[PDB]
Design a protein around this nucleic acid. Structure first.
Ligand SMILES: [Zn+2]
Lengths: 56, 217, 83, 71, 129, 25, 221, 132, 101
RNA sequence: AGGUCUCGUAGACCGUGCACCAUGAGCACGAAUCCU
RNA sequence: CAGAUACCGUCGUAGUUCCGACCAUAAACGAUGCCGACCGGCGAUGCGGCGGCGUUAUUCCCAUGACCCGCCGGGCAGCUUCCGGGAAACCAAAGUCUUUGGGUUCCGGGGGGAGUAUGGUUGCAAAGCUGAAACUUAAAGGAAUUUGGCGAAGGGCACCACC
């Protein structure tokens, strides 16, 4: 019922940018964040640079 | 609406109109209401011709009874003078009542849970209810209004000349519209006086309610 | 609305107002169509003969639409002529 | 137009001539000053003799030197 | 001061039909004004009008319908021939199927199709569509 | 500068030009 | 992926008891559901972008850019529409613009140039649309001339079905939104012009609501 | 500052809406009522619900409220709305009628009525507030 | 641009009014442009009234007032906070502020 | 004959100024779309 | 005050005042030429005229002045308005304009140079009227919105502010 994906890095240019795609509900404070969301961070190596993935 | 003989004021509705203070209206005068006024009485009180009230009342009654779905006509009141009157009008004639806080979006906002989209609007005053008349312009909605000598005339189709200030006149005219619509409907009789209670449609202040409940049982 | 052959070529004929005689637009949401009931002559009963009238939006927002309906009912003859 | 008389052509003509003189291109093309001060004198190409070669600078938002000659 | 009664008359009837009125008064009269409204009445653009015969200059009560779009006056009265009328009809009528040019020829004051048929020209007054 | 004092210094320049014109005859 | 109407017009078109959109245009009923025209106008209703432009709002931290999308809708044999939508992303903006343009579609009639031969091809009179300072004027044209204009009213008149035009513009034509809206207003104003070919009194046909009161009560509350 | 949030007030309003017949003035009894009927993940939230319900019961016991419409004060509003007097309140034996109203009524449909009487008019036309 | 329909004054068909001087300042201001203050106040306000009435030779004595007219320039009126700026839609209000005490 | 006429007491609109208070090197900036 | 020939304070010259002879300049603004017609209302204002319950000039009558109710014509204005227009602020005129023409005079074609050089002319003088060019420039401007900044105003807060 709620999701949030964040990407950051080289997105068609020299200077890095950050795109955020949020749809649904998202709790940010309190202990329900400790047991209602799952946070995973990965690094993607491209040819022109390294790209970041953050999924909740 | 008056070309026949049975559609005329017979004996007693003149007495009700004179008892409820129908003939005397506001001090100032709108220029669209000039055809409905005979002559200014002294101390700044304008006199409304009762014939024109009767004919515009029958025109409004014909416009109401023309639709065959009574759920498609909505009566509007946001003032304390006509709260119970529109509710009992909708109880008698099968209409839909709006009493207090006409929300901005019943007519236009589609996904709102209170989306009521009627075919006919009947309102008791144009000045106090300019917000239904504005939202009646964005949709093809004919309006019925009870218009005073002072109230502006805009987005109206049938203007009944009235005194919409006192409670007796408002309740009496709502009862007359209900009586005429039920008479051309055919669920009530014509020759027999159907008049069970004429005081049923009158708003009163609650101090009179405690005074009445302490005087009576 | 015709051509030299005689076939109807326009897609529809729009309405016109009964007071100002102006063409009602397809997107003029201030325009109205109102039905008024005709009564039997002796009984006072509604039978169902209908005589509808349409008013364009400019006359309605002008403030003179009720006078237009009054003059149409004068012309048809249902409301009393003495008035 | 403003003057709309049936027998008014002169005021229109003289006013049109005066407001045509109150211009820039018509003022430039019809006076002897803009051709007398013109180095080419109403000519497209010209010959000349170089005497010095001077490098003039560029404007504000870009930085270069520009190779030029004195003819 | 008042230098053209016909321009003021057609401006007044244009304002009256643009607001939506039904009856209008024109303060002066002329024979040329009555001929102009007779042309528009024969062509069915205005209704049946009246003449208030007062001893000053006649007042004209014109019945207005919704069939009129614009009435205009060209001032001054320009000389127009048979060969130069097509330019006026092209840049002054809204379409080739409707609209009329009222021009004064020696055989009366009427539309430009009838003057085309009788092969005569003259001075232009105005237009209506 | 505003137009007033630029106008004033232009008038003073006009004055000095006028005296040198009259004394340069 | 089914259609659930919220207004009674959507249901009354949904149950195949409204034959065409022509009586909706005749009775001047407002359209609030976009799938009615998709039900009526199908494969011939095509669309394309005109201009995507960015706008900026100044805040405390940086600048926020939202993209505004213009689009034109209309089949090649009649009706045409236009819509403006702004959103933070481009896909949401173009989808909202397509939906809002498909929702608001005007009809247009076509006339003749002198001789009433064959199907109509041009604008029957001189119409003018204005918004901002933008002026556009449409002239009837002879057959086979082709649309001579700027590229964007050429595109709009191709989606309007008219193939013969003479145009004349004035003002700041570089603003594409006001120029497109002025040409759309000039197209949509072709009915508020009473030509003498419809001076007869119309006959008042029957309204859909009162005709299908029984079906509306039978279907919904 | 102890100001209750909107979730506390909304929950208290709906629990005093759907349940009234098993409530009282004691804080502990309707605290146990709110514990038994409503599932609440904590104790302080349930406690604040119980306190605001107790305050709302004490104000409903005095007079009606515009946000909660319970079953028992309902039918009473339409009892006051459906009250009728045995008199008609417009059928009075004598009606005081203006002379201008009388010369209306002589010319509309009627010539003489024995139920109406006339009143004298005023002597001065002073009817506006002094403004200037 | 045009800030007010009038020019912050009361001159419509005159072209020249008699200038006056300020009270806080000495600035030459036109009469219809200056802010006017016709103040009514007592010599003793609320504390010395009992001391005057309890040390007076005469019983049942009325206390005289001060009747002066204050003429203010615009900057002196703002700086003394006699009048304050308003919103664009609330600028058009012309009634005086209501009095209670 | 009675002996403090009754009903609640913003009962602050006391004032006006208000010492000196100048200046800021720029390179760091790039606007877009649909599913097989 | 770093400086102060400035803001502030004490004196004080021409001038400020009248007569007579000059110059002809202002944000000389309503930043809106003059005449004529048409096109919503509302309540007041100054003048002139008309009609009408009533009160005062001490109790009856008449006219007059002083009030109240309405109109007519002209004038300074005010409030509301999806008449209509404009880039908008706003305008009952800045409306009746691509559906483009009632009559008539003056005046402007990007910003600077520049109201400048010269010529003519008026004047005792200061200066007024007429009035360029060379060259340089890709912007200079008008309305309105969103942020930041006020030694702008009105409400609240903080011991990384004060008492
Ligand atoms: Zn001052």
């Amino acid at each position: 019922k709620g999701c949030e994906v964040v990407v950051s890095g080289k997105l068609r240019g020299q200077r890095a940018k950050s795109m955020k795609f949020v749809d649904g509900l998202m709790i940010h404070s309190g202990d329900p964040v400790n047991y209602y969301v799952d946070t995973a961070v990965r690094h993607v190596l491209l040819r022109q640079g390294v790209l970041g993935i953050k999924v909740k | 609406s008056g070309a026949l003989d049975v559609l005329q004021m017979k004996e007693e509705d003149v007495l009700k109109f004179l008892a409820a203070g129908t003939h005397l209206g506001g001090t100032n005068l709108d220029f669209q209401m000039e055809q409905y006024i005979y002559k200014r009485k002294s101390d700044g009180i304008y006199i409304i011709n009762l014939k024109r009230t009767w004919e515009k009342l029958l025109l409004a009654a014909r416009a109401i009874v023309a639709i065959e779905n009574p759920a498609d006509v909505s009566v509007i009141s946001s003032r304390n003078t006509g709260q119970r009157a529109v509710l009992k009008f909708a109880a008698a004639t099968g209409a839909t009542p709006i009493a207090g806080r006409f929300t901005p979006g019943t007519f236009t906002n589609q996904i709102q849970t209170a989306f009521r989209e009627p075919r006919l609007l009947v309102v008791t005053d144009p000045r106090a209810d300019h917000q239904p008349l504005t939202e009646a312009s964005y949709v093809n909605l004919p309006t019925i209004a009870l218009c005073n000598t002072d109230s502006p005339l805009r987005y109206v189709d049938i203007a009944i000349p009235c005194n919409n200030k006192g409670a007796h006149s408002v309740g009496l005219m709502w009862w007359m519209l209900a009586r005429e619509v039920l008479r051309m409907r055919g669920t009530i009789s014509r020759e027999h006086p159907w008049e069970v209670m004429p005081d049923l449609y009158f708003y009163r202040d609650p101090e009179e309610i405690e005074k009445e409940e302490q005087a009576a049982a | 609305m015709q051509n030299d052959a005689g076939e109807f070529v326009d897609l529809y004929v729009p309405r016109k107002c009964s007071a100002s005689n102006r063409i009602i637009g397809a997107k003029d949401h201030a325009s109205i169509q109102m039905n008024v009931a005709e009564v039997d002559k002796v009984t006072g009963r509604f039978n169902g003969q209908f005589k509808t009238y349409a008013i364009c939006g400019a006359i309605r927002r002008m403030g003179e639409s009720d006078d237009s309906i009054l003059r149409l009912a004068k012309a048809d003859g249902i409301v009393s002529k003495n008035f | 137009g403003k003057c709309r008389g049936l027998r008014t052509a002169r005021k229109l003509r003289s006013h049109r001539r005066d407001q045509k003189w109150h211009d820039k291109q018509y003022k430039k093309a019809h006076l002897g000053t803009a051709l007398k001060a013109n180095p080419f004198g109403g000519a497209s190409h010209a010959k000349g003799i170089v005497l010095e070669k001077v490098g003039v600078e560029a404007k504000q938002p870009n930085s270069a030197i520009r190779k030029c000659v004195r003819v | 001061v008042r230098m053209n009664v016909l321009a003021d008359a057609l401006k007044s009837i244009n304002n009256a039909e643009k607001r939506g009125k039904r009856q209008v008064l024109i303060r002066p009269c002329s024979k040329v004004i009555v001929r102009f409204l007779t042309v528009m009445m024969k062509h069915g653009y205005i209704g049946e009008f009246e003449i208030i015969d007062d001893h000053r200059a006649g007042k004209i009560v014109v019945n207005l319908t919704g069939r009129l779009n614009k009435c205009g006056v060209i001032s001054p009265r320009f000389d127009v021939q048979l060969k130069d009328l097509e330019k006026w009809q092209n840049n002054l009528l809204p379409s080739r199927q409707f609209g009329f040019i009222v021009l004064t020829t020696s055989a009366g004051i009427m539309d430009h199709e009838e003057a085309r048929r009788k092969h005569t020209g003259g001075k232009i007054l105005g237009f209506f569509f | 500068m505003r137009a007033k004092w630029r106008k004033k210094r232009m008038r003073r320049l006009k004055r000095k030009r006028r005296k040198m014109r009259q004394r340069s005859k | 992926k089914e259609w659930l109407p919220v207004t009674k017009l959507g249901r009354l078109v949904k149950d195949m008891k409204i034959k065409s959109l022509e009586e909706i245009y005749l009775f001047s009923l407002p359209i609030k559901e976009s799938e009615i025209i998709d039900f009526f106008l199908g494969a011939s209703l095509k669309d394309e972008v005109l201009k995507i432009m960015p706008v900026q709002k100044q805040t405390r931290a940086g600048q926020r850019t939202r993209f505004k999308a213009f689009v034109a809708i209309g089949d090649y044999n009649g009706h045409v529409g236009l819509g403006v939508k702004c959103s933070k992303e481009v896909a949401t903006a173009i989808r909202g613009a397509i939906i809002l343009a498909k929702l608001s579609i005007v009809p247009v009639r076509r006339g003749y140039w002198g001789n009433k031969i064959g199907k109509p091809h041009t604008v029957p009179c001189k119409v003018t649309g204005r918004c901002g300072s933008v002026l556009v004027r449409l002239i009837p044209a002879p057959r086979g001339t082709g649309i001579v204009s700027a590229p964007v009213p050429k595109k709009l008149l191709m989606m309007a079905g008219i193939d013969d035009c003479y145009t004349s513009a004035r003002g700041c034509t570089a603003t594409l939104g006001n120029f497109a809206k002025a040409t759309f207003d000039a197209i949509s104003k072709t009915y508020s012009y009473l030509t003498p070919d419809l001076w007869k009194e119309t006959v008042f046909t029957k309204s859909p609501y009162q005709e299908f009161t029984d079906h509306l009560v039978k279907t919904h509350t | 500052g102890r100001v209750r949030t909107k979730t506390v007030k909304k929950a208290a309003r709906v629990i005093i809406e759907k349940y009234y017949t098993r409530l009282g003035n004691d804080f502990h009894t309707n605290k146990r009522v709110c514990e038994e009927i409503a599932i609440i993940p904590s104790k302080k939230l349930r406690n604040k619900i119980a306190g605001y319900v107790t305050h709302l019961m004490k104000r409903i016991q005095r007079g009606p409220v515009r946000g909660i419409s319970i079953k028992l004060q309902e039918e009473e509003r339409e009892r006051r709305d459906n009250y009728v007097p045995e008199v008609s309140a417009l059928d009075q034996e004598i009606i005081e009628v203006d002379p201008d109203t009388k010369e209306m009524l002589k010319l509309l449909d009627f010539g003489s009525l024995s139920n109406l009487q006339v009143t004298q008019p005023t002597v001065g036309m002073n009817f506006k507030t002094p403004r200037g | 641009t045009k800030k007010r329909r009038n020019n912050g004054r009361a001159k419509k068909g005159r072209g020249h009014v008699q200038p006056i001087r300020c009270t806080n300042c000495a600035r030459c201001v036109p009469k219809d442009k200056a802010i006017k203050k016709f103040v009514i106040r007592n010599i003793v306000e609320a504390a010395a009234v009992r001391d005057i009435s309890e040390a007076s030779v005469f019983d049942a004595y009325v206390l005289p007032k001060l009747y002066v007219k204050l003429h203010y320039c615009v900057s002196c009126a703002i700086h003394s906070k006699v009048v304050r700026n308003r919103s664009r839609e609330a600028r058009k209000d012309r009634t005086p502020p209501p009095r209670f005490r």
